[PDB]
């Protein structure tokens, strides 16, 4: 019975498509001022082993809009140490709240937390995978261009940040991914091989962009010499499908800014990427607690 969201594949292809569609409907409802409160009396526990303000604000805002409450556990509040400290945090917190989101770095830590939880666990982000941001990215594409099935997606930059999430998503959402990575900054071959069905490595960014429906990048405006040809410009977007949309990993560290040209370009959906963390996560919480609804 008890379903978690630890990795993207914990939902079937159809559940993922229904979720993104549901997130778009929840976004229209909130903006139209509809009151939808299926979680009156319900509580979200938010466990942050490492801080993410974007995660925290979006989850807290979401559960509130649904009539529930969110409990913010900051790193040095509760014991996340491997062993009993982890498993006892899980059983006790889940006897009190109805759903838990966790931000940790152990991929084995989130699995152990889940095993001892009586309630659904959401893995918001780990150090390797960003499943909540990836859901928000797929919602944003869907809202501007419909279904991404059999579309072409071009990742521009290294194998860090959301690269692995996009590679993982290719198979699940049914798209073709090209990774345009600078020489010496390619993803792990072992990863490439895992997703070799849907994903290909392409040095030439101009060729990778050809016929792309979505261009997504973690390359920050100005190592810098090596990334300079991987800077996404209006010029690069001109080589894509005329229906191309542009996404950019949102700023994570000081100095990371996206050019005005790319934010203001009419093909850019960066601001929806950030807002849709709210709506995509509401769709996810609604899905995991649906047997508590109505």
């Amino acid at each position: 019975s008890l379903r978690h969201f630890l990795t993207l594949s914990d939902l079937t292809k159809q559940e993922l498509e229904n979720l993104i569609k549901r997130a778009s409907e929840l976004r229209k409802m909130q903006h139209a001022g509809e009151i939808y409160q299926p979680f009156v009396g319900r509580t979200l526990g938010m466990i942050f082993e490492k801080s993410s303000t974007r995660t925290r604000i979006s989850f807290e805002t979401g559960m509130g809009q649904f009539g529930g409450n969110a409990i913010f556990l900051s790193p040095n509040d509760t014991q996340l140490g491997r062993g009993e400290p982890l498993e006892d945090s899980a059983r006790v917190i889940s006897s009190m709240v109805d759903i838990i989101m966790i931000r940790t770095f152990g991929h084995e830590k989130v699995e152990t937390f889940a095993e001892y939880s009586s309630v659904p666990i959401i893995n918001a982000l780990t150090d390797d995978y960003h499943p909540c941001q990836l859901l928000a990215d797929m919602q944003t594409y869907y809202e501007h261009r419909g279904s991404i099935e059999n579309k072409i997606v071009t990742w521009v930059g290294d194998g860090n940040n959301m690269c692995s999430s996009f590679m993982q998503a290719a198979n699940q959402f049914g798209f073709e991914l090209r990774v345009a990575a600078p020489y010496g900054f390619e993803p792990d071959p072992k990863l490439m091989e895992r997703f070799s069905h849907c994903v290909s490595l392409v040095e030439n960014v101009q060729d990778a962009a050809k016929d792309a429906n979505l261009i997504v990048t973690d390359v920050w405006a100005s190592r810098a010499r090596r990334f300079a040809p991987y800077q996404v410009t209006p010029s690069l977007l001109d080589k894509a499908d005329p229906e191309v949309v542009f996404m950019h990993c949102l700023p994570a560290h000081r100095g990371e800014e996206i050019s005005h040209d790319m934010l203001n370009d009419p093909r850019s959906v960066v601001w929806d990427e950030a807002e849709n963390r709210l709506h995509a996560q509401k769709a996810l919480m609604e899905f995991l607690l649906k047997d508590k609804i109505k």
Copy 2:
């Protein structure tokens, strides 16, 4: 369309009078146990570049009573650095929440935040101006003595704390202000000149108090030699209008205490000054989001 509260004059004289009257009605409603929840599904973002527990508790309590939720962003949560860090915090937070209060020190920072916000901004307090406390002070006067229009207000102390807020309020609420400031601790002449229409500088505290309807002070009980004659006592209140009320800036730093004599004096409305941050801010949030109500 989009209206902010960055400075007192962002509301007309009549809106300010309606707001104070509305705050008094909201206070009676809450105390009578009336449930008034126009903000079900709505969120307040509270941005603190510098901490104010009094601001935080009052806003959080207010939005909660209205059926909404408040998100507490502490200083080193979100990026308030001048430039893009500021403007991107604004656009993204306002795509998710319905109203933002900000506590900063830049008067240019709150204006820039407002320019890029899709939602109303409340400037709770800056390092120079205390517009939320000033609304609570005007509510408190109104509740005990009615309209302050054509009344006499006497500020006793230096040009710090709420002095500039009172000088600014004189013109907007239509009162005459005397600043009774010790020699060498007078407000900036340039300020005095700005508000020279409604505001006068008066050394003799006894003369300043003559016919006063409200005496307000930032002079803390026992430099100290120089302030000693500017200590507000029952004696000084005896020289005012028999209807005079007494207010005192609330404690901001360790060691700042108000005498028992002044707190317990029947003309003292200090405790209402503190409580009415709750009600005045509810009136303000209701005003700025009224097109979302009903």
Copy 3:
């Protein structure tokens, strides 16, 4: 009129029995998914002079389930310094919120806070007494075995942690307590004498366990040489009443773990002890604010 919960005896024997019974009914309601929201528009202020995550999560979750909001004041937010800083925090916070829980160490501090509060004060825990955990422990016993009146309770370990709370509870809930304390780690004689009516000191843990209905311990699995015979095992439980239940102080410091044998033993109610902080505190808040209900 105004009633506080500063110590267990602030409620009569019958109010305590009604509260534990009410907590059990509230637990069944929440688990059955009943919406019970008597505190729409109401606020809990949570003052932590010393941090307790277990207290914070349980209170915050409880007030939320009841439709209210909880304000989390962390140590260095508000001034708890003895004198005016304490009494002014009390009067102002209570003019805004409807109920306050306080975690302090002064037994004179919680009394002074209460004297100047216009609203009910809950003393969640002090450094000596754990009245909220003790209510959760009495709920847990009641749910598994009914009334504890005229039952035998055996405390195994030193005079720290919940020992004094159990000694205090003996008289109020009408049970007989044996303290099985290792030589040189007995409670204060002056305490023993205070509760000498209901409480006895018994060195031999085997004899103390004889006919016990509840065995409770703060002895942590492996000074250690001296506590080793005071380790509660399935063996020790075999010498008690066949209806015996086992409780254990919940972990407070790093290294404090309860054996798997004792957690998984069918007589162990440790997990209910932790969950019932939620339900017992809801029963308490409902009792203290009942004249605001319906």
